[PDB]
Amino acid sequence: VARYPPIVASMTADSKAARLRRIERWQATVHAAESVDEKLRILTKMQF
Amino acid sequence: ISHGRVFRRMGLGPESRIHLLRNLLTGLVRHERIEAPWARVDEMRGYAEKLIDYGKLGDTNERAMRMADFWLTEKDLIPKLFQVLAPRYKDQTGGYTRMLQIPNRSLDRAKMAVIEYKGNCLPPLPLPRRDSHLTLLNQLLQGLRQDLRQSQ
Amino acid sequence: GNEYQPSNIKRKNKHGWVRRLSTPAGVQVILRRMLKGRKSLSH
Amino acid sequence: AAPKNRRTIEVNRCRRRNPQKLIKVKNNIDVCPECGHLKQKHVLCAYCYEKVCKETAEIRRQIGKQEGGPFKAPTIETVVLYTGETPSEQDQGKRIIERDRKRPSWFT
RNA sequence: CCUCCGCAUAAGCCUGCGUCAGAUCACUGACAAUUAACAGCCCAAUAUCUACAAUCAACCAACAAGUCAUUAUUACCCUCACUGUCAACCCAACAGGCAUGCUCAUAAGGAAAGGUUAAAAAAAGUAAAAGGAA
RNA sequence: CAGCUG
RNA sequence: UAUCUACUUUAUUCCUCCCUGUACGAAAGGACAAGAGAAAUAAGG
Ligand SMILES: [Mg+2]
Ligand SMILES: [Mg+2]
Ligand SMILES: [Mg+2]
Ligand SMILES: [Mg+2]
Ligand SMILES: [Mg+2]
Ligand SMILES: [Mg+2]
Ligand SMILES: [Mg+2]
Numbered sequence: 001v002a003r004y005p006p007i008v009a010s011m012t013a014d015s016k017a018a019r020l021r022r023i024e025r026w027q028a029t030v031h032a033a034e035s036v037d038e039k040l041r042i043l044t045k046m047q048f
Numbered sequence: 049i050s051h052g053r054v055f056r057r058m059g060l061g062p063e064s065r066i067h068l069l070r071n072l073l074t075g076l077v078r079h080e081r082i083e084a085p086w087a088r089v090d091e092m093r094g095y096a097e098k099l100i101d102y103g104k105l106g107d108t109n110e111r112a113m114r115m116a117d118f119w120l121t122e123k124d125l126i127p128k129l130f131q132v133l134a135p136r137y138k139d140q141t142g143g144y145t146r147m148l149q150i151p152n153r154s155l156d157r158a159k160m161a162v163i164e165y166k167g168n169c170l171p172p173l174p175l176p177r178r179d180s181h182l183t184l185l186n187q188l189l190q191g192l193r194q195d196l197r198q199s200q
Numbered sequence: 201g202n203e204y205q206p207s208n209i210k211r212k213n214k215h216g217w218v219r220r221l222s223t224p225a226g227v228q229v230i231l232r233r234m235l236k237g238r239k240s241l242s243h
Numbered sequence: 244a245a246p247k248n249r250r251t252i253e254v255n256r257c258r259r260r261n262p263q264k265l266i267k268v269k270n271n272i273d274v275c276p277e278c279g280h281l282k283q284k285h286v287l288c289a290y291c292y293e294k295v296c297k298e299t300a301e302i303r304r305q306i307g308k309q310e311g312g313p314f315k316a317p318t319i320e321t322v323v324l325y326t327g328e329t330p331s332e333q334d335q336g337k338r339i340i341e342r343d344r345k346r347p348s349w350f351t
Numbered sequence: 352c353c354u355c356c357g358c359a360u361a362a363g364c365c366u367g368c369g370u371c372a373g374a375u376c377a378c379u380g381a382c383a384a385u386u387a388a389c390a391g392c393c394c395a396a397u398a399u400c401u402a403c404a405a406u407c408a409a410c411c412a413a414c415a416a417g418u419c420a421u422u423a424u425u426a427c428c429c430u431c432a433c434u435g436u437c438a439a440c441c442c443a444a445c446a447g448g449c450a451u452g453c454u455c456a457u458a459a460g461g462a463a464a465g466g467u468u469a470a471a472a473a474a475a476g477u478a479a480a481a482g483g484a485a
Numbered sequence: 486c487a488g489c490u491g
Numbered sequence: 492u493a494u495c496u497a498c499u500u501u502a503u504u505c506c507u508c509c510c511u512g513u514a515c516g517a518a519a520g521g522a523c524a525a526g527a528g529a530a531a532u533a534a535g536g
């Protein structure tokens with residue numbers, strides 16, 4: 001009955017756990033991308 | 049003119065003072081003892097004792113869980129506030145923290161303070177003791193108390 | 201004061217050894233620097 | 244504006260040596276009874292507070308070793324134990340932070 | 352908590368937060384590094400050819416009329432050298448400027464607060480009774 | 486002109 | 492971007508009303524003063 005928030009890092013902090021969580025929100029956009037052109041447009045756009 | 053202005057103005061706005069104090073309060077729920085500069089500490093001391101008074105309102109209370117959700121930036125401390133700190137202080141009604149002064153900070157010579165939460169596992173602070181009851185003045189006054197009790 | 205907007209092509213083409221020797225006046229520029237005793241006669 | 248004349252060292256010495264600019268001899272200063280290094284009243288002893296700070300530093304290091312990783316605040320009270328001490332009957336249902344030195348005279 | 356910033360190439364600069372050591376709001380000495388496929392660095396003559404833009408090019412639509420090409424004979428047999436590759440960087444100022452490709456809020460990059468108090472005056476922002484250029 | 490606005 | 496001098500807490504008025512539409516004048520006319528009011532400004536809160 002106790003509604004504890006989930007123990008995760010934050011999305012906006014300047015830490016190293018928070019960065020991994022930002023990586024997960026990018027990847028979560030890939031999982032929810034419908035067509036394969038969308039997925040391949042996400043997985044290749046940041047040119048490093 | 050600041051008559052009856054009760055809040056320090058801090059940080060770089062009202063929002064930023066509430067985020068500074070929220071970081072100090074998060075630090076003190078986590079570590080149970082903090083050195084920080086003095087004005088920041090007593091501002092946050094006001095907020096700290098209120099936060100336990102929301103911790104005693106029960107885990108199941110919705111308003112308490114909203115306040116704990118805001119005020120504790122690390123979410124693992126919200127089980128600590130409702131199962132460690134609030135059961136610890138379930139007897140006494142106030143005075144959950146103690147604040148003392150440290151010597152001034154070496155860097156910029158700021159007035160420094162410690163607050164801890166009372167009754168924590170950490171080594172105790174060198175608390176300022178009153179003088180012994182067996183001193184000269186305290187024995188004269190003890191004798192005087194014995195005489196004024198002898199009036200009845 | 202960003203009057204100097206550098207490139208090496210303009211620098212060697214303007215003031216290099218070959219442009220200095222291309223004219224008689226420029227040869228006299230080199231000769232004056234050689235007589236003052238300078239470490240850089242040109243670019 | 245700019246200064247009309249140059250101030251002299253007689254005027255200057257009267258300015259920067261009057262008692263509003265001198266350092267006040269303070270007299271809060273006592274001797275800490277426990278350590279004998281002189282402290283100030285109304286302020287904790289620097290020395291004894293440095294003792295307590297260093298021991299909370301070792302204890303928090305071992306808290307960090309027994310937790311492992313961030314976001315591991317236990318829902319249990321904690322007890323610090325030193326070498327050769329049984330956990331008491333009161334210490335049951337509390338996580339235990341074993342130390343490697345002796346129990347100090349001032350920790351209790 | 353910001354992010355109108357980033358990451359690369361270009362131009363520029365030329366070892367300029369690598370390791371070891373030391374002196375000095377709180378540089379000197381030693382050592383080590385940038386490895387070519389990317390990019391520069393090209394071309395055997397002598398003749399002779401090159402009327403019909405580009406624009407999703409399809410028509411349609413035009414005028415300001417356009418950025419791209421060979422053939423003939425002769426000579427020709429060895430082969431992967433040389434150079435660039437670093438950085439927190441340049442031109443200024445003691446604010447600004449900067450070509451191009453991607454990312455268009457970021458996976459990348461960062462911090463507006465030395466500590467306090469909360470006077471005046473000044474700057475900026477927000478709110479303002481009734482009135483609405485007086 | 487009407488409207489808004491320290 | 493203030494160096495020097497100097498400096499930084501020394502109750503009026505209008506309108507109304509009354510007295511009075513009396514005094515005064517002889518008719519026209521028509522008081523003062525004092526009082527009550529309501530305003531406004533300034534001064535101090
Ligand atoms: Mg290639
Ligand atoms: Mg590079
Ligand atoms: Mg980042
Ligand atoms: Mg401030
Ligand atoms: Mg400051
Ligand atoms: Mg102005
Ligand atoms: Mg208004």
Ligand SMILES: [Zn+2]
Pocket residue numbers: 174275276277278279280282288289290291292
């Ligand atoms: Zn002491």
